[PDB]
């Protein structure tokens, strides 16, 4: 169908500015002042930030700002936030009712701070044990950057099998959220002393411990 | 803005037709003879498949079909293909600008059997409540095709107030895992009769309910 030409990265720093350009033909990004810009995250429900060459929707202040030149449009997103970590697709009207779009993109917002994790490790519930099954979640919260290496242990010597650790994904605080489950049979749970979760974030271990002799 | 609520996963074997139904909310999304539809592939640029309720674009096949009920706008793909595999989204407008987008739907060509989520809900620990923290986890495991919609309750009244959820990651056994949390104060917890976690997949919806207990 033939697509509009953009840059694939538009890196700024936390409160700088960024120009994303989107370029077409005299038939599209040049013929009509009907160019739109769209903000989309990581699998998420996908917002429109500016609608009719330059004009903004219902709340997006006057920091999401856009312009056309001739054959080129440009989105000059001012004073970088952290939230804005997103894929910014452009569009424009072709004629004869159909609409033409921009290439596969991403803005990297640089110099955001580093969070070392909140590791929350749970018991198996009094629903689960009653079901004759046992599973323990190691929740790995609000961390940046999106690299963690999870490992588990039984009394002190590793568990590799039982374990199933999820990948990194954004919290909409725009840090990261990830998990890991170790699935037991309640005989295998009630036998022991310690059952620990050991997580490696940026050259530091965060080990939490959980045990039997409780009310459950 | 916000609300247009479609299916999480819409699955189908190659041949076997699929319909994607998108329901709306009480004002705007009624006496509205618009609603367009989009497809978004791997990394690539989004494409317009249906425009204004039922019409199509130029390079679009005889395969695709959008319609009216009242609240719900369908999209019946007839003749399913590997080419057709993608995320898909339904649109609209209000204000002039104030244009609402769908919650998203995977279209999957089944290459593995269908599984419906083993949805385990945990309370916060004896210890975590010693720590003055309160967080619950809804662990959603062992599912295929790999798009789940999640939803939390506080005394049956639906939260969108403390909730972070993860993108669905493929396990050791070729099926999937996700995880949702709710964070509160140890009093925000204690203050209620019950909390719950509800998960929409294909045919399925599945709740699971925890009540605050003292362990004292």
């Amino acid at each position: 169908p033939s697509a509009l030409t953009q840059p694939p990265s538009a890196s700024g720093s936390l409160g700088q500015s960024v120009t994303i350009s989107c370029t077409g033909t005299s038939s599209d990004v040049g013929g009509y002042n009907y160019v739109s810009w769209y903000q989309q995250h990581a699998g998420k429900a996908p917002k429109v930030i500016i609608y009719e060459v330059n004009k903004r929707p219902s709340g997006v202040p006057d920091r999401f700002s856009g312009s056309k030149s001739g054959n080129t449009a440009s989105l000059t997103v001012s004073g970088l936030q952290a939230e804005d970590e997103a894929d910014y697709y452009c569009s424009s009207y072709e004629g004869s009712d159909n609409f033409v779009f921009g290439t596969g993109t991403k803005v990297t917002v640089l110099g955001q701070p580093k969070a070392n994790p909140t590791v929350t490790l749970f018991p198996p519930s009094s629903e689960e044990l009653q079901a004759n099954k046992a599973t323990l979640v190691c929740l790995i919260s609000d961390f940046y950057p999106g690299a963690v290496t999870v490992a588990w242990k039984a009394d002190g010597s590793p568990v590799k099998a039982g374990v199933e650790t999820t990948k990194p994904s954004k919290q909409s605080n725009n840090k990261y959220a990830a998990s890991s489950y170790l699935s037991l049979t309640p005989e295998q749970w009630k036998s022991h002393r310690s059952y620990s979760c050991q997580v490696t974030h940026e050259g530091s271990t965060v080990e939490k411990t959980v045990a039997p002799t409780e009310c459950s | 803005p916000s609300a247009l609520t479609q299916p999480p996963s819409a699955s189908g074997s190659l041949g076997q037709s699929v319909t994607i139904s998108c329901t709306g909310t009480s004002s705007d999304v009624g006496g509205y003879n618009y609603v367009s539809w989009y497809q978004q592939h791997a990394g690539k640029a989004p494409k317009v498949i249906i425009y204004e309720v039922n019409k199509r674009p130029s390079g679009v096949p005889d395969r695709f079909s959008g319609s009216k009920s009242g609240n719900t706008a369908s999209l019946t793909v007839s003749g399913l293909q590997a080419e057709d595999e993608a995320d898909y989204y339904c649109s609209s407008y209000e204000g002039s600008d104030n244009f609402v987008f769908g919650t998203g739907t995977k279209v999957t060509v089944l290459g593995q059997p269908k599984a419906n989520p083993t949805v385990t809900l945990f309370p916060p620990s004896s210890e975590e409540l010693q720590a003055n923290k309160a967080t619950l986890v809804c662990l959603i495991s062992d599912f295929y095709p790999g798009a789940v919609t999640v939803a939390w309750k506080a005394d049956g009244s639906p939260v969108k107030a403390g909730v972070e959820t993860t993108k669905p990651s493929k396990q050791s056994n070729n099926k999937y895992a996700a995880s949702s949390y709710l964070s509160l104060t140890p009093e925000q917890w204690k203050s209620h009769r019950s909390y719950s976690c509800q998960v929409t997949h294909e045919g399925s919806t599945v709740e699971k309910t925890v009540a605050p207990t003292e362990c004292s």
Binding site: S36 | S91, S92, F101
Partner: peptide, 6 residues
């Protein structure tokens, strides 16, 4: 989402 009938 768009522009317009146009």
């Amino acid at each position: 989402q768009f522009h317009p009938x146009x």
